[PDB]
Amino acid sequence: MLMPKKNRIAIYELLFKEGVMVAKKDVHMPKHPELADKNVPNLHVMKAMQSLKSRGYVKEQFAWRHFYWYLTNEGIQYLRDYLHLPPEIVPATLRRSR
Amino acid sequence: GHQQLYWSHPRKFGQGSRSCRVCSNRHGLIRKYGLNMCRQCFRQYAKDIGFIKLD
Amino acid sequence: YTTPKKNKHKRKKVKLAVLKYYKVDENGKISRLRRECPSDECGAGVFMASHFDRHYCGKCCLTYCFN
Amino acid sequence: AVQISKKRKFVADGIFKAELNEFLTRELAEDGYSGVEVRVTPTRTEIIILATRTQNVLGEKGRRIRELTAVVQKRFGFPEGSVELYAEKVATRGLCAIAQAESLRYKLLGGLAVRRACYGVLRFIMESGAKGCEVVVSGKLRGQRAKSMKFVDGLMIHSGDPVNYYVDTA
RNA sequence: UUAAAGGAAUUGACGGAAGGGCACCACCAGGAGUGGAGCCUGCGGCUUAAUUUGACCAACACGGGAAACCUCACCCGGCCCGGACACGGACAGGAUUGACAGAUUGAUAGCUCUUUCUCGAUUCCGUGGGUGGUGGUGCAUGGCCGUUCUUAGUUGGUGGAGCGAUUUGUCUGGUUAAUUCCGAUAACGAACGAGACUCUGGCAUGCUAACUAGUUACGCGACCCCCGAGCGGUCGGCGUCCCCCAACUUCUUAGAGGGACAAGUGGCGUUCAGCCACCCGAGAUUGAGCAAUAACAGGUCUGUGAUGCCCUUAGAUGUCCGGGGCUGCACGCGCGCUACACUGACUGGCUCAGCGUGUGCCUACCCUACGCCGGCAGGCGCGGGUAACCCGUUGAACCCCAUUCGUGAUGGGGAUCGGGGAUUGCAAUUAUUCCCCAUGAACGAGGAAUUCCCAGUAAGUGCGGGUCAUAAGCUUGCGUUGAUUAAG
Ligand SMILES: [Mg+2]
Ligand SMILES: [Mg+2]
Ligand SMILES: [Zn+2]
Ligand SMILES: [Zn+2]
């Protein structure tokens, strides 16, 4: 899209602390509810996750009006390199509940 | 873009703002009881809502 | 089907390939040539504009008088 | 905040119930979904799936529940610690119509003859202890004009109220 | 010159062919009408920059489509990219964002331009490839729906008949709303539809239970009262689960069970099914839902991240914004409102309902009591209600009683049109609606033709949902008043 560097790390850090993010199909909403703190319009939330599909890192289902997304493991080894994270940090995907 | 007047017409009162939560249409939708579904849309899920017919 | 009026181009920028905003004498000298912006943020940081007479803070869109 | 009226309590939970039924159709169709059933409590609320292949909905130490616990949680306004999922096997896989309608979907995606494939699921319900079943396959079969082939077997009612609970449609 | 022409049988469809049945989407007997008038609204036509469009019993108040803009496609213009990825280039010694000012616009669109500051790999460019579409194709489809089709109809198994398509089962007859039953019988046993069923309505002074329903009794308060009493009369005035300063369920709301089966009794009928009468009874046919087999080249790709294929993809059919149109009128048609008056219209009294809906995740805005301003719409202050808790005991209209008017296009009728006042809204002009004064048009019961209906029915009369910021002449529900005709 236009891809500001502050908001991409703002959406990736939640998209890596859990393996999901739950945007809704309306571009005319200037406030994503689950971030709600760095004045993202969810254009940036859409058009990031468009790019994550085309590399094959994320997955999506298109509910009634909601997009759901999921982390493939090739996305996790992509986000642990792009967020510069050491190879012990894993999301709530693998085993965080017993 | 040029955000001052991209989406500047007021989507407020009137059928330029009501939409189907389920189908994404603006025509014929039912705003009774806070449903906001498309009328064509309403028939599918009406058994799942809990709306029975006469039998 | 025709489009007679020719909407002419997109926006391609000015493409001026030199910075050079600090003149130097006497073997090393700090000297401004454009005014700095009087905002709360960029004192002696990002410049204020140098028009033929007036000055304008480019980042936060405040302006000086036409003089 | 302020709570809304009992008329619009009961259409909110139904459209809660209708919404996740539509998503969990889209996700678990390749894993034999066959419905959900909800429990609202003033605690953790407990949502149980009725999947046939409960092996496939479980991830490696249960990944594909825990992200599917979250997409319900991070949409329908549940705080951290109020909603959970359970996978449960439906008894008689070949007796609820939602189950094997998706089975003969993914039999048709294997490139089978439609007449050979529909017989085997027609045979599957009737040998599973049913009272009657019929399958209508309608669309563009071999031919340019579309046509429908029905494969009725057994006996089956059509009218009155007892076609509400003696039958299930898919 | 030509690939059939023909013969016999079978199944349908049709017959201005018989026979038996049946339906107010059929008639009779009728009622109310519609068609005539003004207007409201859809359709054709014309006109247009555009008047976007889909549909011709089973299109035409239909797309729940009552469009100020948005919707929104169509027309005149003007921005934006929300063109993912993949490759090459551009690419720290100079890729790309944003923006004050001015001729520049319709526009405080850096749209562009003159000039110059600013943004930090984000992108930009070429080439492939996505993607979006209220773009095409409902004759490429799914799903849904309409219909032939509200009528009784449909199909196997196994036997019987035929070379066979097929047929018997599924019928002479009686009977039924009904292949409904009784019987007759190369059929026997079954299935579906019909029916049962579910919802609903009518009855239970019997059962259960009520400060979010009530009565009744009893306290209190007020008021009348021959005359002056009161266990007198009235009171939706107050209290009696407020910690007993009463009981109870008739009325109200349900829940369970009851109740009606053609049972009883005559008559008819093969004394078979059943029919016709009655008595008891609340009721001796309440009303609707679902609803088969096989089909329609029915409708809908403009309802849908249901979808194939094609088209188009940046000077974009994407999307946003400003205006305009969908309302334009020599005419024709279809739903419908108000009427043509005295069985009325006014004016003032008077007393009666039921179904239901009400403050929202996004999403702003709800129903309104009461008080005080206004001659009216309305304007404020102040409450209550997320509801058997408040509006509300929903003082609905017609009807009823007194008044005025007198057969005159009249005080019938209220179209048209001028001036004003308010509300909704970003905006009321091509009048949103409402209010006030004034203006006072056809219209005297409507030719041929044609529609719906037979009991709380037709019809009159209002009321509430939907649409809804503003709003109903439409629809879908309610009660009220209530029939004339008919059992063919
Ligand atoms: Mg659609
Ligand atoms: Mg007269
Ligand atoms: Zn500053
Ligand atoms: Zn096309």
Binding-site entries of B for Zn(2+) = 20, 23, 38, 41
User: At what resolution in Å was this solved?
Assistant: 3.5
As a CATH number, domain A1-98 is 1.10.10.10
Nearest chain A alpha carbon to B17: A28
Q: How far apart are the first and last CA of chain A?
A: 40
Longest pairwise C-alpha distance within chain C:
66
CATH (one of 3.30.300.20, 3.40.50.620, 4.10.830.10, 3.30.300.30) for B1-55:
4.10.830.10
Q: How many helices (H) and strands (E) does chain A have?
A: 3, 2
Which of the nucleotides in strand E have any atom less than 7 Å away from a protein CB atom?
63-65, 69-72, 78-82, 84-86, 93-101, 108-113, 115-123, 125, 134, 140-145, 191-199, 287-294, 297, 303-305, 315-316, 320-322, 357-365, 386-388, 424-426, 465-470
Whole-Å CA distances, C4 to C1, C7, C10: 9, 9, 17
Domain ranges of chain A: 1-98
Contact indicator for D27, A61 with CB cutoff of 8 Å? yes
Beta strand segments in D33-145, E:
36-39, 45-49, 83-86, 132-133, 136-139
Contact indicator for D84, D69 with CB cutoff of 8 Å? yes
Backbone CA torsion sign across C44, C47, C53, C56: negative
Question: Which residues of chain B lie closer than 8 angstroms to A25, CB-CB?
Answer: 24
| Contact between the CB of D144 and strand E at under 7 Å | yes
